[PDB]
Amino acid sequence: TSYIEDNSNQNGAISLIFSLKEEVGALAKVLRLFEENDINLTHIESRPSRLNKDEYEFFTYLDKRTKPVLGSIIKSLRNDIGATVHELSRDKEKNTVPWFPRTIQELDRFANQILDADHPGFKDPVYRARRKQFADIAYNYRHGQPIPRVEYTEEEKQTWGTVFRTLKALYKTHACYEHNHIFPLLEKYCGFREDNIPQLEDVSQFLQTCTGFRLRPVAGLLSSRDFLGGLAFRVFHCTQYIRHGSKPMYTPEPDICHELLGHVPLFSDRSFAQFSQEIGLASLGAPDEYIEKLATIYWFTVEFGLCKEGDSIKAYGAGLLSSFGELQYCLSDKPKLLPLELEKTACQEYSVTEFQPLYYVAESFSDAKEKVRTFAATIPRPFSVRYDPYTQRVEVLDNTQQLKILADSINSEVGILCNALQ
Amino acid sequence: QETSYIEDNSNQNGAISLIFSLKEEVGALAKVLRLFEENDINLTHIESRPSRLNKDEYEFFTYLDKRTKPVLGSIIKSLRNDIGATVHELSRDKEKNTVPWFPRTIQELDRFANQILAELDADHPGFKDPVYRARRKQFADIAYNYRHGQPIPRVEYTEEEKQTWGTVFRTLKALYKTHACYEHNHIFPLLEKYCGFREDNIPQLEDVSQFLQTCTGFRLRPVAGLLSSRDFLGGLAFRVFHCTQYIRHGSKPMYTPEPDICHELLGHVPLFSDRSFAQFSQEIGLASLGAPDEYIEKLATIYWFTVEFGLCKEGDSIKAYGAGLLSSFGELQYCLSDKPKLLPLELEKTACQEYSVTEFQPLYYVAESFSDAKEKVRTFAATIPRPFSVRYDPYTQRVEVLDNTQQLKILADSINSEVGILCNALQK
Amino acid sequence: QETSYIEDNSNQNGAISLIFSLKEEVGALAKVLRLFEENDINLTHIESRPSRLNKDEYEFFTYLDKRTKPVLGSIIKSLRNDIGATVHELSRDKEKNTVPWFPRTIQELDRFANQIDADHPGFKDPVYRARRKQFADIAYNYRHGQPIPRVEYTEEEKQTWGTVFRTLKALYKTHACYEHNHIFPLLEKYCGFREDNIPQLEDVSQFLQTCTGFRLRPVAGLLSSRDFLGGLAFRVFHCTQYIRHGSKPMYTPEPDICHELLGHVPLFSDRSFAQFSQEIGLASLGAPDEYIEKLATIYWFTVEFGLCKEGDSIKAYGAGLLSSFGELQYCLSDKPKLLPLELEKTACQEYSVTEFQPLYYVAESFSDAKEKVRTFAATIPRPFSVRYDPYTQRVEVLDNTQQLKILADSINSEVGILCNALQK
Amino acid sequence: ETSYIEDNSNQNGAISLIFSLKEEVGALAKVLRLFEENDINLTHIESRPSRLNKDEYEFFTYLDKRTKPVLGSIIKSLRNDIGATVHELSRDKEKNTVPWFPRTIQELDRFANQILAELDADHPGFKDPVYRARRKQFADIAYNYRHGQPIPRVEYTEEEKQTWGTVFRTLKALYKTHACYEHNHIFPLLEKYCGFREDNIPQLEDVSQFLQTCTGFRLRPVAGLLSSRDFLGGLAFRVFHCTQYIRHGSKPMYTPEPDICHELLGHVPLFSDRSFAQFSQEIGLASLGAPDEYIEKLATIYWFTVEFGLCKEGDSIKAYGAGLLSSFGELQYCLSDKPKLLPLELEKTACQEYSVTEFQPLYYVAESFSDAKEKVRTFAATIPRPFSVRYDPYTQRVEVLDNTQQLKILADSINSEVGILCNALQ
Ligand SMILES: [Fe+3]
Ligand SMILES: [Fe+3]
Ligand SMILES: [Fe+3]
Ligand SMILES: [Fe+3]
Ligand SMILES: [Mg+2]
C-alpha cells in the first residue's frame, strides 16, 4: 500500500501542549519549574493565546533525554497548576499523543527521515550520483530558504519533453476543469514547456500566489504521518529529481514530472487546496489506524481520484494526470466506479504495483472537503485542530472558552452578511 | 491647528493599476495577454491567477505607471467593450473616475514605502549635533534600501543611545502596572523575556518582527520617516507596521517631536501582539484601501483617537492603550487624572474631532474593547464611498477586491467553514 | 409499470389564486380592494395581511374559481401595469402562463381534500363495501380544525389488527430503524397501540402534534400526488381510517389503518424525519407534473420503501416495509440491489407497486436526506421559493432576495441562541 | 409603585421535573416504575421523544405539594442511579429550585386566574353599581376561560361604545403624525377586517384570529392584572393576556387599569408585526425561570420598551409604546423636546426608576425592533438559569437546552442552513 509507518530519530520528539491563565507570578513559576529541571530557557517559548485573551501557550522542544523527569513536571503541571496537559511523543509511548508539528518551521526536524536494486537506473552511476546530489539539496534544505536551482542535462529534458508532450495532448479530454483551468498559467508564468523543466522555487512562488501552498524539497519517500501532517500547513513535500531516461514512461516513484504535472495544478486551486489541507489537519495526532485510513483516502482521492463534471467524469488524481497509460484507462468502461464514501473508502484494499481496478468518484472538491471534515470528527484525538495562516501555526481547540470566542466570531460574521444583503 | 493626517504625494512615474476578472473561454486569455504584450507592456507587469471564488474566472494583477498612460484608454476600451470585463482603474494621482491606488499584494508595499512627507528641522532638539544628523541619515539609508522579505539589518546602538533608552524604559515600566491596559501588561513580560526588552538593551527590529509574526502575524518594516496616511494605514491592512529604527536625541529623553524607536517598541509592539488589537488595526487598514482623501482624513483622526491616543474600558475602571500614552510618562499620568474629558467612542463624531499633536489631548474617547472598536470600524467603513469591498487573505498575503455578490459568497463560505469547525470541536 | 404517481384532476370550479404584494400608499389598498369589489368579487374572498419581511408591503390572498375567469385578465392587467405588482397566477388546470395551484394556508387543504375494484379482496362482500363508504363519508364530512370522529371497530376488525400487530412487532426490534423502535413504546403507552385495541385517529393526531407538530387528516381514498405531497408541506398527513379486509390480514394492494399507524406514525413523531418529509412537501408546491412524478418516486424510495444506514448495519424505515412482514424480512436479505441515495438518479428509478422492490436506496440519515431533497427542489422550475411558517400555519412564497434574507436572519438568530447556550 | 407584581402561589402550587433519558433496555420502564411505586400515578407524567437528541426522551411531570414527600428520593435516584440532569421547578421558589414556568402553551391555564374582589374605592366607577357588576361579568368570563376555546362575544352598550368612540377618535386623529410606521401600516387592516371603527367595539375572537394569521400571536382573556412572571411568560408562547372590559364612561381619557382600548389600540397593531412579535417573545423567553430580581429588570425593560417605548425612523422619532398609543395626552407629550431621552441600554434601563402614576420624564429610544430583540437576547444570557430556552412553534412547547449534545444539533442545524444559503447564492 501507499502507507509508510513513521519511524523515530535517535532522540525522537517530545512536545507539551498546555495553556495557563495569567496570574501574579505564574509565568515566572512555570519558567522556573522548567529551568530547575535542566530544561534551559531556549527550549520553552511562551506566546499569547489566539482565543483566550488571558492565557499563554507554551511550546516545548524536548527529546527522550528529558523523559526521566518529564513525568514529574507533568505531574506538577496538571495537579499543582491545574492545567490540561497533552503530551506529544514521536515514539508513541503509552499515555502519549502521536507527535505533530505545532509551527510550520518545526516541519524541518524530521523532514529528512527518508524511507533500488531493481530500479531501471541502478546500473547508471551518473544517475545514482545525480540522485545523491538532489538528496543532498533536500538534506540541507530548511524552511524559509529558496529552493536551490539545478540545471538539468539535455537527456533529462528530453525525458521531460516526452512526458510533457504525451500528457498535454491528453489533458484537454481527460483532466478535470481545474487542472485545465490553471495549466495555461503554469505554461505562461512557470516555464512549463516541452524544452524546459521548471524550477521548484519558481513553482513554489506561483503556488504561494494562488493558494498559499509551498513546495519543500525531499530526498525520497517520507512516512504517511510526516507527509500528511505537512499538508495541514499547505506544504507539499516535493521531489526534485526526474525519472531515468531509458524508460521515460514507466515509474514507480514520484519524479519532478509526477509532482509538477500531477499535483501542482490542483494545488493551485482554492477548493482543492482547502480539501488537501483538510486532510492534513485531520492527520495531526491521529492514531496509526487512522493514519492508515487517511493514507488510503489520499490514495483514492488526491492520488487516484475521479470527480463529477456535469454529466461526465474527469480525472483529478495525480497518479492519473502523470501516467498516460492509466489516465486513458480510468475513463474507459474497464474500471469499476464507486461513489466516494469515506467510511467505506478508508477500508478499501488497493495495490500500488498494478493499475487500480476501482476508483472512487467525488461529487466536487467542496463536497469532498466536507466529507473529509465529517470523517475527521470520527478520528480519535484528545482535542481538535484549526490552522492559523497568520502565524502559520496550528491551534488546538478543546477548552469551552475557546469555543465561545469562535462562536462569537461566527456570530459577528453572520451579522456582517445580514447587514450586507442591503 | 496641525493634525496627524498626511496627504499622499506621487513619485515621478506614479502608480496605475487595473483590477479586473475574465471568464474562461477559448482564446480569451491569449487575446488579453496579447493586447497587453503588443503595446510594449511585457509579461512581467501582467500576472494572471485563478479567482478564489468563481472557479471559472481569472484575476489579473497589473503593475503599470504613466509610461503606459498613452495606451491605457485603448486597452480599457477593448476590455470593457470588445471583451466585456468590468475594469476598475487605480491611479495614485486620483484623476476623476478613478479609484485612489492601493497595493494589492504585500510586496507592493515596497513601491511607495519611501514617499516621506531632507535635513531635519532646525527646531529639532538635535539640529546642532552633526553626529546625530549623520546617524539619522544612516538609518534613513537602511530603510531606503530595505525591500519586503529581507531580514531587518541589525545596528549596534551607542552607549549614550542605550542610556536614553534606559531612562525612558525605566520610568515608563515603573508605571505600566497601574496605568496600562490589560493587553499591554499581558504581553510586555513576554517581550522582556523573549525579545530582550531590558533597560540596558535596545531590541533589534528583526527579533521583534519575528515575535510579532509568532503572535498575530504582524511584521515590522523599517521606514526612514513619516509616510502618508494612505500608505501607512494601507500597510496595516496586511498587518505590516512601518517602524522607525532611530532613537531620540540624548539631551531631551522625554520630548520627541517625532516617533523614535521608543514610541514604536513601547507604544505599539505590545498591542500589535494581541489578536483583538491586531484584527482591530487591520480593519482600519482594510478601511483605508481606496478611500477618498477626505475619508483618509477621517480614518487618520479615528486612528489618532484610537490606536494613538485611545482609552479602553476594563470592567468598571479605565486604562490606556494609546501608543502616544504608553510612551509618554507625562501624558500617561495625565490621561487617567481628573483633568481630561472622556467621551464614549462613536466614530461618526470621533472622525470630525479637532486635535493638536503638540499639546496634551484635552479630550479622549473611551472604547468598550478592541472587538467593539473593530465592529465600529467596519460599520463606519460601510459608509465610505468605494466602488467595491476589500478583504485580506493571509494565505497569499494579497488583498481581495470584491463586489457585493462576491462579498456575500466569502462571508457565507467563511461562516460554513468556522461552523463546521465548531461542530467537530464541540464533541472534542 | 403502474407507479405511485397519481396525476391531479380538477373540480367543476377548480381553484384560482393570485399571489402579489403591494407597497403601502395613500389609497392603494382601497384601490386594489375596489377593483375586486367592482367586478363582483366581494371582500370575503380577498384577504390582506401585512408582509412579514417588507415592512412596507401587503400580502393578498385570493380565493377564486372559474366564475372569475372572465374577469381574471382585466384584474391581472391592472395589477401588473397600473399598480406595479408582480402577480403569480395559480390555476389547477395548469393553463400556460400559470403556476400549478397549491394551498397557501393550512385551511385551503379542505378545498381538494375530497378529490378521490373488481380485484379487491372485499368486492364480493357488500358489508365491507358499505363500511368503506362509511369511512369515506367520515372523511368527506371532515374539515380542518375539527376533532377526528371516533369510530368503534368490530371484533373481527380488531382481530385483523391483532394479527398484523403481533407479527410485525415481533420483528421490529431486529428489522426496524432506531427511530421506529424509539417511539413505538410511547405509542403503546399513550396511544393504545396494543394487540387488542385499534387506536383512534384523534388521539394519534394529538400525540403527533405534541411530538413534531404533525397532524392526521382523514381521507376517503387515494389523492393525487400533487395534493397529498402538498399536504405534507403543512405537516398534514392524509390518513385512512378503514382497515383491511379480514380474510387476508397479510395482503391489501392499498394502505389501511395498519399501514398508516404502524408504518407512518412512529417516524412522523421524530423531528429529523418530520423536517425531511416536510421538505418533500415544500418541494411539491407548484412543481410541474414531471417533477411531481419525480417527487412521488423519491417519496416511494424514501418514506415508503426506504432503507437507512445505522452504524455498520442497514435498517428499514419505509412505511411499506414496516407494515409488510413479508417484504420487511425480504428487504434486509442479500437479494435486493442497494444504491446510494442520489435524487437526480433516484427520481428516474423504475418501480412496480404490485411486486417486491428489486432495488432499494440507502440514505445516510434523515438530516442528510433533507439536504438532498432541498437541493433537488432547487432544480424544480418554479418562479419563486417556498418556506413554511408554523406560527400562522401558512406557506411563504419568496423570491431569491427574500429567501437570502430569511436564511441570513434565521441563521443569525440560531447562532445567537447557540452563543448564549454555550456559556451555560 | 412600579409595573412589577411579585408572583404569588396557589394553595397547591406547582412542581415540575425537567430531565431527559437516553434509551436503553428497561430505562423507560425504570423511570415510570420509580414514579408509580411512590404512588405518583401515570396520568401526571407524559413521556415524549427529545427534539434534538434523537436517542433521548423528555419527561413532562405535572405535580403539586402532595407529591413533595417522595420528590427528593426520586430526584436522588434520577440523578445518581439513572444519570440524568434533573432540574427541579417549584412555584414557591425554594432554594436549589428553579422558579416554575409553563412548559406547554396549555399549561398557561393553571395560574391564569391569580388576581393581583371589589374595586379600589378610588376607581372612577366605584359609585356605579352597574359598572361594578359589569367588571365582575368580564372577570367571570375570564375565570371560566381555558386555552383553546373561542373568546365569548359580548354585546357592548351604547355608553361603552361612546367611550370607545371618544378614545378612538382622539387617538386615531393623532396616530398618523405620532405613531410608528408599523402601527400605521397594520391599523387600516384592523379597521377593515376586525371592525376597528368609531361606532363599533371589536370582538376579542376576531382580533385573536387576525393576530394568528399575522404573527401567530393569540389573545387570552384575563380578569385583572397578573404577576409579572406569569404575563411575561405568556409572551414566550406569543400569548397576550388581554383584558375585555372598558374604562368608565365619566372619564374616557383617564385609566389606572388597562381597558379594551389600551389592549386593542396600543398593543394589537404591533403584535401583528413579525419583528415586534419576535421582540416581545424574546422578552418572554428571557423571563422563563428568571429570579425575582430579574423578573424586576424584565418588567422595567418591558415598561420602557413595549409599554412606553420610542423608536427611530430615519432622522425623526416616533412612539410605539402601548401606554403612549392609548393616551392622547402623553402621546403628544412624548414627541416634544420636553422629555429626557437616553439611548436604549438594558443594563442601565433595567435599573431605571419610574412612576406609573405620572407621565414618564424619561423615555428610552430603540434603534429598531430587531436591534431591541438582539439587546434582549444579550441581556438574557446574563440571567441566572441552569439552562437556556428556545420556543418550538410546531409543538407549542418550550425546549430547554443545557447539555453539549443539544448544542451539537443546534450547531448542525446552523451548519445546514449556512450550506443552504451557500447553494442559494449560486
Ligand atoms: Fe504523489
Ligand atoms: Fe505611532
Ligand atoms: Fe403510504
Ligand atoms: Fe399594557
Ligand atoms: Mg558600542
mmCIF file with all atom_site columns, N, CA, C and O in Angstrom, chain A residues 307-335:
data_model
loop_
_atom_site.group_PDB
_atom_site.id
_atom_site.type_symbol
_atom_site.label_atom_id
_atom_site.label_alt_id
_atom_site.label_comp_id
_atom_site.label_asym_id
_atom_site.label_entity_id
_atom_site.label_seq_id
_atom_site.pdbx_PDB_ins_code
_atom_site.Cartn_x
_atom_site.Cartn_y
_atom_site.Cartn_z
_atom_site.occupancy
_atom_site.B_iso_or_equiv
_atom_site.pdbx_formal_charge
_atom_site.auth_seq_id
_atom_site.auth_comp_id
_atom_site.auth_asym_id
_atom_site.auth_atom_id
_atom_site.pdbx_PDB_model_num
ATOM 1   N N  . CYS A 1 307 ? -13.724 12.889 -10.288 1.00 0.00 ? 307 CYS A N  1
ATOM 2   C CA . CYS A 1 307 ? -14.686 13.885 -9.841  1.00 0.00 ? 307 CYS A CA 1
ATOM 3   C C  . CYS A 1 307 ? -15.775 14.064 -10.890 1.00 0.00 ? 307 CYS A C  1
ATOM 4   O O  . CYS A 1 307 ? -15.561 13.814 -12.079 1.00 0.00 ? 307 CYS A O  1
ATOM 5   N N  . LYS A 1 308 ? -16.945 14.504 -10.437 1.00 0.00 ? 308 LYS A N  1
ATOM 6   C CA . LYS A 1 308 ? -18.090 14.702 -11.315 1.00 0.00 ? 308 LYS A CA 1
ATOM 7   C C  . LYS A 1 308 ? -18.030 16.083 -11.950 1.00 0.00 ? 308 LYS A C  1
ATOM 8   O O  . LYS A 1 308 ? -17.704 17.072 -11.290 1.00 0.00 ? 308 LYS A O  1
ATOM 9   N N  . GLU A 1 309 ? -18.342 16.141 -13.245 1.00 0.00 ? 309 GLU A N  1
ATOM 10  C CA . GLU A 1 309 ? -18.268 17.378 -14.026 1.00 0.00 ? 309 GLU A CA 1
ATOM 11  C C  . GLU A 1 309 ? -19.456 17.368 -14.987 1.00 0.00 ? 309 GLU A C  1
ATOM 12  O O  . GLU A 1 309 ? -19.377 16.810 -16.086 1.00 0.00 ? 309 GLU A O  1
ATOM 13  N N  . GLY A 1 310 ? -20.552 17.993 -14.566 1.00 0.00 ? 310 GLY A N  1
ATOM 14  C CA . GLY A 1 310 ? -21.792 17.877 -15.316 1.00 0.00 ? 310 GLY A CA 1
ATOM 15  C C  . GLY A 1 310 ? -22.271 16.439 -15.334 1.00 0.00 ? 310 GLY A C  1
ATOM 16  O O  . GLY A 1 310 ? -22.372 15.776 -14.296 1.00 0.00 ? 310 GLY A O  1
ATOM 17  N N  . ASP A 1 311 ? -22.570 15.938 -16.532 1.00 0.00 ? 311 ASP A N  1
ATOM 18  C CA . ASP A 1 311 ? -22.980 14.551 -16.703 1.00 0.00 ? 311 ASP A CA 1
ATOM 19  C C  . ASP A 1 311 ? -21.811 13.614 -16.978 1.00 0.00 ? 311 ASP A C  1
ATOM 20  O O  . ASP A 1 311 ? -22.006 12.394 -16.992 1.00 0.00 ? 311 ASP A O  1
ATOM 21  N N  . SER A 1 312 ? -20.611 14.148 -17.190 1.00 0.00 ? 312 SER A N  1
ATOM 22  C CA . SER A 1 312 ? -19.439 13.346 -17.500 1.00 0.00 ? 312 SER A CA 1
ATOM 23  C C  . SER A 1 312 ? -18.562 13.184 -16.260 1.00 0.00 ? 312 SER A C  1
ATOM 24  O O  . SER A 1 312 ? -18.891 13.645 -15.164 1.00 0.00 ? 312 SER A O  1
ATOM 25  N N  . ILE A 1 313 ? -17.421 12.524 -16.446 1.00 0.00 ? 313 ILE A N  1
ATOM 26  C CA . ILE A 1 313 ? -16.487 12.225 -15.365 1.00 0.00 ? 313 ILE A CA 1
ATOM 27  C C  . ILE A 1 313 ? -15.073 12.480 -15.867 1.00 0.00 ? 313 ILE A C  1
ATOM 28  O O  . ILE A 1 313 ? -14.689 11.989 -16.934 1.00 0.00 ? 313 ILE A O  1
ATOM 29  N N  . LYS A 1 314 ? -14.301 13.249 -15.102 1.00 0.00 ? 314 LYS A N  1
ATOM 30  C CA . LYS A 1 314 ? -12.923 13.565 -15.440 1.00 0.00 ? 314 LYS A CA 1
ATOM 31  C C  . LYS A 1 314 ? -12.018 13.175 -14.280 1.00 0.00 ? 314 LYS A C  1
ATOM 32  O O  . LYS A 1 314 ? -12.470 12.986 -13.147 1.00 0.00 ? 314 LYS A O  1
ATOM 33  N N  . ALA A 1 315 ? -10.729 13.056 -14.576 1.00 0.00 ? 315 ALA A N  1
ATOM 34  C CA . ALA A 1 315 ? -9.742  12.600 -13.608 1.00 0.00 ? 315 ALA A CA 1
ATOM 35  C C  . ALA A 1 315 ? -9.055  13.785 -12.943 1.00 0.00 ? 315 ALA A C  1
ATOM 36  O O  . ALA A 1 315 ? -8.691  14.761 -13.607 1.00 0.00 ? 315 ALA A O  1
ATOM 37  N N  . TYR A 1 316 ? -8.882  13.693 -11.622 1.00 0.00 ? 316 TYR A N  1
ATOM 38  C CA . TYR A 1 316 ? -8.110  14.676 -10.879 1.00 0.00 ? 316 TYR A CA 1
ATOM 39  C C  . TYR A 1 316 ? -7.002  14.050 -10.043 1.00 0.00 ? 316 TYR A C  1
ATOM 40  O O  . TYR A 1 316 ? -6.296  14.777 -9.337  1.00 0.00 ? 316 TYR A O  1
ATOM 41  N N  . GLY A 1 317 ? -6.830  12.733 -10.093 1.00 0.00 ? 317 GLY A N  1
ATOM 42  C CA . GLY A 1 317 ? -5.765  12.111 -9.333  1.00 0.00 ? 317 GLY A CA 1
ATOM 43  C C  . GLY A 1 317 ? -4.413  12.370 -9.975  1.00 0.00 ? 317 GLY A C  1
ATOM 44  O O  . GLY A 1 317 ? -4.250  12.277 -11.192 1.00 0.00 ? 317 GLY A O  1
ATOM 45  N N  . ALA A 1 318 ? -3.431  12.712 -9.136  1.00 0.00 ? 318 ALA A N  1
ATOM 46  C CA . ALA A 1 318 ? -2.087  12.970 -9.644  1.00 0.00 ? 318 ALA A CA 1
ATOM 47  C C  . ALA A 1 318 ? -1.477  11.724 -10.266 1.00 0.00 ? 318 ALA A C  1
ATOM 48  O O  . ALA A 1 318 ? -0.727  11.823 -11.246 1.00 0.00 ? 318 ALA A O  1
ATOM 49  N N  . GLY A 1 319 ? -1.780  10.546 -9.716  1.00 0.00 ? 319 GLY A N  1
ATOM 50  C CA . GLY A 1 319 ? -1.338  9.307  -10.327 1.00 0.00 ? 319 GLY A CA 1
ATOM 51  C C  . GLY A 1 319 ? -1.946  9.063  -11.690 1.00 0.00 ? 319 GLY A C  1
ATOM 52  O O  . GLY A 1 319 ? -1.390  8.295  -12.482 1.00 0.00 ? 319 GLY A O  1
ATOM 53  N N  . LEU A 1 320 ? -3.079  9.700  -11.983 1.00 0.00 ? 320 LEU A N  1
ATOM 54  C CA . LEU A 1 320 ? -3.693  9.623  -13.301 1.00 0.00 ? 320 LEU A CA 1
ATOM 55  C C  . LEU A 1 320 ? -3.155  10.706 -14.232 1.00 0.00 ? 320 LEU A C  1
ATOM 56  O O  . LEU A 1 320 ? -2.788  10.419 -15.374 1.00 0.00 ? 320 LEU A O  1
ATOM 57  N N  . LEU A 1 321 ? -3.076  11.947 -13.749 1.00 0.00 ? 321 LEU A N  1
ATOM 58  C CA . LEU A 1 321 ? -2.616  13.052 -14.581 1.00 0.00 ? 321 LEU A CA 1
ATOM 59  C C  . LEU A 1 321 ? -1.135  12.972 -14.928 1.00 0.00 ? 321 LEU A C  1
ATOM 60  O O  . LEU A 1 321 ? -0.679  13.732 -15.789 1.00 0.00 ? 321 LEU A O  1
ATOM 61  N N  . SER A 1 322 ? -0.378  12.080 -14.293 1.00 0.00 ? 322 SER A N  1
ATOM 62  C CA . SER A 1 322 ? 1.036   11.899 -14.596 1.00 0.00 ? 322 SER A CA 1
ATOM 63  C C  . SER A 1 322 ? 1.347   10.527 -15.182 1.00 0.00 ? 322 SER A C  1
ATOM 64  O O  . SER A 1 322 ? 2.521   10.152 -15.267 1.00 0.00 ? 322 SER A O  1
ATOM 65  N N  . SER A 1 323 ? 0.329   9.769  -15.587 1.00 0.00 ? 323 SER A N  1
ATOM 66  C CA . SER A 1 323 ? 0.520   8.428  -16.141 1.00 0.00 ? 323 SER A CA 1
ATOM 67  C C  . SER A 1 323 ? -0.376  8.300  -17.369 1.00 0.00 ? 323 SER A C  1
ATOM 68  O O  . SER A 1 323 ? -1.575  8.034  -17.242 1.00 0.00 ? 323 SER A O  1
ATOM 69  N N  . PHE A 1 324 ? 0.210   8.519  -18.550 1.00 0.00 ? 324 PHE A N  1
ATOM 70  C CA . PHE A 1 324 ? -0.527  8.394  -19.807 1.00 0.00 ? 324 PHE A CA 1
ATOM 71  C C  . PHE A 1 324 ? -1.300  7.083  -19.893 1.00 0.00 ? 324 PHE A C  1
ATOM 72  O O  . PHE A 1 324 ? -2.450  7.060  -20.347 1.00 0.00 ? 324 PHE A O  1
ATOM 73  N N  . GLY A 1 325 ? -0.680  5.978  -19.477 1.00 0.00 ? 325 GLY A N  1
ATOM 74  C CA . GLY A 1 325 ? -1.332  4.684  -19.603 1.00 0.00 ? 325 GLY A CA 1
ATOM 75  C C  . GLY A 1 325 ? -2.612  4.586  -18.795 1.00 0.00 ? 325 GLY A C  1
ATOM 76  O O  . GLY A 1 325 ? -3.670  4.234  -19.323 1.00 0.00 ? 325 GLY A O  1
ATOM 77  N N  . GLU A 1 326 ? -2.536  4.898  -17.501 1.00 0.00 ? 326 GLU A N  1
ATOM 78  C CA . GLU A 1 326 ? -3.704  4.769  -16.640 1.00 0.00 ? 326 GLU A CA 1
ATOM 79  C C  . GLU A 1 326 ? -4.675  5.939  -16.766 1.00 0.00 ? 326 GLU A C  1
ATOM 80  O O  . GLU A 1 326 ? -5.860  5.777  -16.452 1.00 0.00 ? 326 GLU A O  1
ATOM 81  N N  . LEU A 1 327 ? -4.212  7.106  -17.225 1.00 0.00 ? 327 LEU A N  1
ATOM 82  C CA . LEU A 1 327 ? -5.130  8.217  -17.464 1.00 0.00 ? 327 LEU A CA 1
ATOM 83  C C  . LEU A 1 327 ? -6.131  7.874  -18.560 1.00 0.00 ? 327 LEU A C  1
ATOM 84  O O  . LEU A 1 327 ? -7.324  8.175  -18.441 1.00 0.00 ? 327 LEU A O  1
ATOM 85  N N  . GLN A 1 328 ? -5.658  7.253  -19.641 1.00 0.00 ? 328 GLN A N  1
ATOM 86  C CA . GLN A 1 328 ? -6.567  6.752  -20.665 1.00 0.00 ? 328 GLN A CA 1
ATOM 87  C C  . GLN A 1 328 ? -7.444  5.642  -20.104 1.00 0.00 ? 328 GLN A C  1
ATOM 88  O O  . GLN A 1 328 ? -8.631  5.544  -20.437 1.00 0.00 ? 328 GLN A O  1
ATOM 89  N N  . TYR A 1 329 ? -6.864  4.785  -19.261 1.00 0.00 ? 329 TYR A N  1
ATOM 90  C CA . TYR A 1 329 ? -7.598  3.660  -18.694 1.00 0.00 ? 329 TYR A CA 1
ATOM 91  C C  . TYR A 1 329 ? -8.770  4.120  -17.833 1.00 0.00 ? 329 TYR A C  1
ATOM 92  O O  . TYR A 1 329 ? -9.866  3.553  -17.913 1.00 0.00 ? 329 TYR A O  1
ATOM 93  N N  . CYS A 1 330 ? -8.564  5.151  -17.009 1.00 0.00 ? 330 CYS A N  1
ATOM 94  C CA . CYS A 1 330 ? -9.531  5.475  -15.962 1.00 0.00 ? 330 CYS A CA 1
ATOM 95  C C  . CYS A 1 330 ? -10.855 6.004  -16.504 1.00 0.00 ? 330 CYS A C  1
ATOM 96  O O  . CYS A 1 330 ? -11.848 6.010  -15.769 1.00 0.00 ? 330 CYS A O  1
ATOM 97  N N  . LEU A 1 331 ? -10.902 6.441  -17.761 1.00 0.00 ? 331 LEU A N  1
ATOM 98  C CA . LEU A 1 331 ? -12.137 6.942  -18.351 1.00 0.00 ? 331 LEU A CA 1
ATOM 99  C C  . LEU A 1 331 ? -12.804 5.947  -19.291 1.00 0.00 ? 331 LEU A C  1
ATOM 100 O O  . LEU A 1 331 ? -13.857 6.262  -19.857 1.00 0.00 ? 331 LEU A O  1
ATOM 101 N N  . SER A 1 332 ? -12.224 4.765  -19.473 1.00 0.00 ? 332 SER A N  1
ATOM 102 C CA . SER A 1 332 ? -12.840 3.732  -20.290 1.00 0.00 ? 332 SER A CA 1
ATOM 103 C C  . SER A 1 332 ? -13.958 3.039  -19.512 1.00 0.00 ? 332 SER A C  1
ATOM 104 O O  . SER A 1 332 ? -14.287 3.405  -18.379 1.00 0.00 ? 332 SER A O  1
ATOM 105 N N  . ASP A 1 333 ? -14.548 2.017  -20.126 1.00 0.00 ? 333 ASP A N  1
ATOM 106 C CA . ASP A 1 333 ? -15.565 1.204  -19.476 1.00 0.00 ? 333 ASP A CA 1
ATOM 107 C C  . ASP A 1 333 ? -14.966 0.056  -18.673 1.00 0.00 ? 333 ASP A C  1
ATOM 108 O O  . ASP A 1 333 ? -15.714 -0.724 -18.075 1.00 0.00 ? 333 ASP A O  1
ATOM 109 N N  . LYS A 1 334 ? -13.635 -0.054 -18.651 1.00 0.00 ? 334 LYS A N  1
ATOM 110 C CA . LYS A 1 334 ? -12.987 -1.126 -17.896 1.00 0.00 ? 334 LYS A CA 1
ATOM 111 C C  . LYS A 1 334 ? -13.021 -0.905 -16.387 1.00 0.00 ? 334 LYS A C  1
ATOM 112 O O  . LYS A 1 334 ? -13.386 -1.845 -15.658 1.00 0.00 ? 334 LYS A O  1
ATOM 113 N N  . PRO A 1 335 ? -12.662 0.263  -15.850 1.00 0.00 ? 335 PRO A N  1
ATOM 114 C CA . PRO A 1 335 ? -12.575 0.406  -14.391 1.00 0.00 ? 335 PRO A CA 1
ATOM 115 C C  . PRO A 1 335 ? -13.926 0.271  -13.704 1.00 0.00 ? 335 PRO A C  1
ATOM 116 O O  . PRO A 1 335 ? -14.990 0.455  -14.299 1.00 0.00 ? 335 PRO A O  1
#
